Write an enzyme that holds these catalytic residues in place. Structure first.
Site, PDB file in Angstrom:
ATOM      1  N   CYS A 419       0.893  -1.189  -0.096  1.00 47.17           N
ATOM      2  CA  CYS A 419       0.068   0.218  -0.050  1.00 47.17           C
ATOM      3  C   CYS A 419       0.937   1.323  -0.062  1.00 47.17           C
ATOM      4  O   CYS A 419       1.804   1.255  -0.850  1.00 47.17           O
ATOM      5  CB  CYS A 419      -1.062   0.046   1.081  1.00 47.17           C
ATOM      6  SG  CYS A 419      -0.305  -0.035   2.725  1.00 47.17           S
ATOM      7  N   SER A 420       0.749   2.037   0.922  1.00 44.71           N
ATOM      8  CA  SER A 420       1.641   3.335   0.802  1.00 44.71           C
ATOM      9  C   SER A 420       2.891   3.152   1.876  1.00 44.71           C
ATOM     10  O   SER A 420       3.962   2.909   1.299  1.00 44.71           O
ATOM     11  CB  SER A 420       0.878   4.690   1.570  1.00 44.71           C
ATOM     12  OG  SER A 420       0.065   4.478   2.493  1.00 44.71           O
ATOM     13  N   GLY A 422       3.093   0.324   3.733  1.00 46.99           N
ATOM     14  CA  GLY A 422       2.933  -1.205   3.825  1.00 46.99           C
ATOM     15  C   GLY A 422       2.796  -1.695   5.318  1.00 46.99           C
ATOM     16  O   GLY A 422       3.312  -2.778   5.543  1.00 46.99           O
ATOM     17  N   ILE A 423       1.869  -1.007   5.869  1.00 44.70           N
ATOM     18  CA  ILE A 423       1.548  -1.439   7.466  1.00 44.70           C
ATOM     19  C   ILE A 423       0.140  -1.235   7.921  1.00 44.70           C
ATOM     20  O   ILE A 423      -0.091  -2.633   8.500  1.00 44.70           O
ATOM     21  CB  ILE A 423       2.698  -0.745   8.577  1.00 44.70           C
ATOM     22  CG1 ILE A 423       2.400   0.729   8.539  1.00 44.70           C
ATOM     23  CG2 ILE A 423       4.095  -1.222   8.385  1.00 44.70           C
ATOM     24  CD1 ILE A 423       2.880   1.464   9.375  1.00 44.70           C
ATOM     25  N   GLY A 424      -0.526  -0.540   7.409  1.00 51.92           N
ATOM     26  CA  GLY A 424      -2.134  -0.617   7.597  1.00 51.92           C
ATOM     27  C   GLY A 424      -2.951  -1.473   6.778  1.00 51.92           C
ATOM     28  O   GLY A 424      -3.627  -2.479   7.415  1.00 51.92           O
TER      29      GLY A 424
END
Length: 485
Positions: A419-420, A422-424
Site C-alpha cells: 500500500c503506501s 506497507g503496514i495498515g
C-alpha cells in the site's frame, strides 16, 4: 508502555500532569484520534495525533508505525516544536488494557474459564463479589490441576495480598508476584506464567462474538496495542545513510531479522542489498509486506520479485490519493515492454473487474530469456481514502481470486502485498488472508484468535494493522466469509 491512559478525559489528564507530574511529564490518550499531553513551564500543551489507517501522524511532527516508536523518537531526539521536551512518562494505574484484567466476574465463572482455556500459570484479576472495591487473583496450577484464589485488598488507594508490600496499582502487584511467586504453606508455587486467553474463539462462535464486540472492539484493540513494546527487534539497516532515501517515510522501517535481503547487486553500488520489505510467515503461503515504490526503488522492487520467485502482487492503493503519490507506476502500459535495470517486464494483458484491475506481466532478467515467468498483479482500486470499506465482500472476492491464482502456480514464492507505508491496509489484507486460509481448509472446525494473529504478524513487521476500524473490518471479513460457507 504505561504512559498510555485509555480512559482519561482531557481535564483529568491536565489535573494528573499538574498534581502528580513535573516539567517534561507526558501521557498519551485516545474516531481514531489520539492526544499527547505534555507539561511545560507549569502548563499543559496538547499535541494531536491522527491515524487514518496508514500511519500515526503527529501534527507538526513526523509519521510513525506505532505510538511507542513516536514516544521513543522524541524522548531520544529539539525535534518536537509548536521546544517541547518529553522527559517523564506519567504511568497509568488503570488495568483495563491488560490481558489479565476481567472486572465484574464470579469465582465459579473464573474457575470455569480457567478450566475451559487455561493451563499451568494461567491467571486473571477480577472485582471481588463479597468485598466491593477489593480484587481477586485467580491462578491455575498443575499438568491433577487446581485453581487458587488470592484476596487482593484495596486500602487507602493501595493494593496488597493481606501482608508484605502495598502497591500503587494492580499492575505493580501483578508484576511483583510474577517475578517473586507466592508460595503456599504446603509448598505450592503460584507462578503467574501467562494471562488467561479470552480472544481465541471457535469459527462458528464469530457471529455471537461480533455481536458482543459491537455492544467492545476498541477495548480489545487497546489490549493488543498495550503489547507492541514486547517486540524488541532492531531496525538498523533502514537507518543507514545510504538506505534513508529508500524509505517512503523515514521512521517507518522494516525489522532486520525478517527484512528482504537483495543479492546479485551492482558491484559499483556500495549498499544494494536493501528494500523496505519484510517476509511474513504465518506461525501455508508466505507474504512480503512492502511500501509503494519510490522512483529510486522501482528497480529494487523488480529484483525482490525476481529473487523471491513471487508470482502474485497485491496493490491496495491508487497511485495518487488526495493529490499525493502513494506509489509510482512500476509496471508498463498494456502491451508495452519496459526495462527496469537488469529486469525486463512486459504487460501482456489487463482485465478490469468491479473492485480491481488484474495485470498479466511477464518478468525476466535481461540477457537470459529462460528466466521468464508470469507475474499476476492484482490492483484493488475501490478502497476508500480514509477508513475501511462498508461491506467486506469486495475484499473477500478479491482475496479468493488471489489465493486461487497463487495455488495454481507450482513452487510460487511469497505473495507481495503493498500500500503506501506497507503496514495498515497491507496488514489488514494479510491478516484477513491468513485467517480465511484457516477457515477454507478447516471450515467451522477451527479456533481463530484475531489479536494473536496480528501480534504474530507484527513480530515480523511493526505497525501491521493500524486502526480500530481495520481491526473491526478483519472480524467483519472473517464473519462474512463464514456466513457464505
Amino acid at each position: 508502555r504505561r504512559w498510555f491512559h485509555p480512559n482519561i478525559t482531557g481535564v483529568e489528564a491536565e489535573n494528573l500532569l499538574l498534581t502528580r507530574g513535573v516539567d517534561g511529564s507526558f501521557l498519551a490518550r485516545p474516531p481514531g484520534d489520539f492526544t499527547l499531553s505534555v507539561r511545560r513551564n507549569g502548563a499543559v500543551t496538547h499535541i494531536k495525533i491522527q491515524n487514518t489507517g496508514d500511519y500515526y501522524d503527529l501534527y507538526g511532527g513526523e509519521k510513525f508505525a506505532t505510538l511507542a516508536q513516536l514516544v521513543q523518537y522524541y524522548m531520544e531526539h529539539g525535534q518536537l516544536k509548536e521546544v517541547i521536551e518529553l522527559k517523564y512518562p506519567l504511568n497509568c494505574a488503570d488495568p483495563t488494557s491488560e490481558r489479565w484484567f476481567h472486572g465484574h466476574l464470579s469465582g465459579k465463572e473464573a474457575e470455569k474459564l480457567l478450566t475451559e482455556k487455561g493451563k499451568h500459570g494461567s491467571f486473571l484479576v477480577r472485582e471481588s463479589q463479597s468485598h466491593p472495591g477489593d480484587f481477586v487473583l485467580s491462578v491455575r496450577t498443575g499438568d491433577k490441576s487446581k485453581v487458587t484464589h488470592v484476596m487482593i485488598r484495596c486500602q487507602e488507594l493501595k493494593y496488597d495480598v493481606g501482608g508484605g508490600e502495598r502497591f500503587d496499582s494492580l499492575t505493580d502487584l501483578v508484576e511483583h508476584y510474577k517475578k517473586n511467586p507466592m508460595v503456599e504453606t504446603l509448598g505450592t508455587v503460584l507462578q503467574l506464567k501467562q494471562p488467561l486467553n479470552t480472544t481465541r474463539i471457535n469459527a462458528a462462535e464469530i457471529e455471537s462474538r461480533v455481536r458482543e464486540l459491537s455492544k467492545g472492539f476498541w477495548e480489545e484493540f487497546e489490549t493488543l496495542q498495550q503489547q507492541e513494546c514486547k517486540l524488541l527487534y532492531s531496525r538498523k539497516e533502514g537507518q543507514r545513510q545510504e538506505n534513508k532515501n529508500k524509505n517512503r517515510y523515514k521512521n517507518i522501517l522494516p525489522f532486520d531479522h525478517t527484512r528482504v535481503v537483495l543479492h546479485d547487486g551492482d558491484p559499483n553500488e556500495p549498499v544494494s542489498d536493501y528494500i523496505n520489505a519484510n517476509i511474513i510467515m504465518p506461525e501455508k503461503k508466505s507474504y512480503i509486506a512492502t511500501q509503494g515504490c519510490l522512483q529510486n526503488t522501482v528497480n529494487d522492487f523488480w529484483r525482490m520479485v525476481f529473487q523471491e520467485n513471487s508470482r502474485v502482487i497485491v496493490m491496495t492503493t491508487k497511485e495518487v490519493e488526495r493529490g499525493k503519490s502513494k506509489c509510482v507506476k512500476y509496471w508498463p502500459d498494456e502491451y508495452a515492454l519496459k526495462e527496469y535495470g537488469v529486469m525486463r517486464v512486459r504487460n501482456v494483458k489487463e482485465s478490469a473487474a468491479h473492485d480491481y484491475t488484474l495485470r498479466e506481466l511477464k518478468l525476466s532478467k535481461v540477457g537470459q530469456g529462460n528466466t521468464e515467468r508470469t507475474v499476476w498483479q492484482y490492483h484493488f482500486r475501490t478502497w476508500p481514502d480514509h477508513g475501511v470499506p462498508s461491506d467486506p465482500g469486495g475484499v473477500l472476492d478479491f482475496l479468493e481470486e488471489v489465493h486461487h491464482k497463487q495455488e495454481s502456480i507450482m513452487d510460487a514464492g511469497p505473495v507481495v502485498v503493498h500500500c503506501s507505508a506497507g503496514i495498515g491496509r497491507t496488514g489488514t489484507f494479510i491478516v484477513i488472508d491468513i485467517l480465511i486460509d484457516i477457515i477454507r481448509e478447516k471450515g467451522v472446525d477451527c479456533d481463530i484468535d484475531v489479536p494473536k494473529t496480528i501480534q504474530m504478524v507484527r513480530s515480523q513487521r511493526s505497525g501491521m494493522v493500524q486502526t480500530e476500524a481495520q481491526y473491526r473490518f478483519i472480524y467483519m471479513a472473517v464473519q462474512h466469509y463464514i456466513e457464505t460457507l
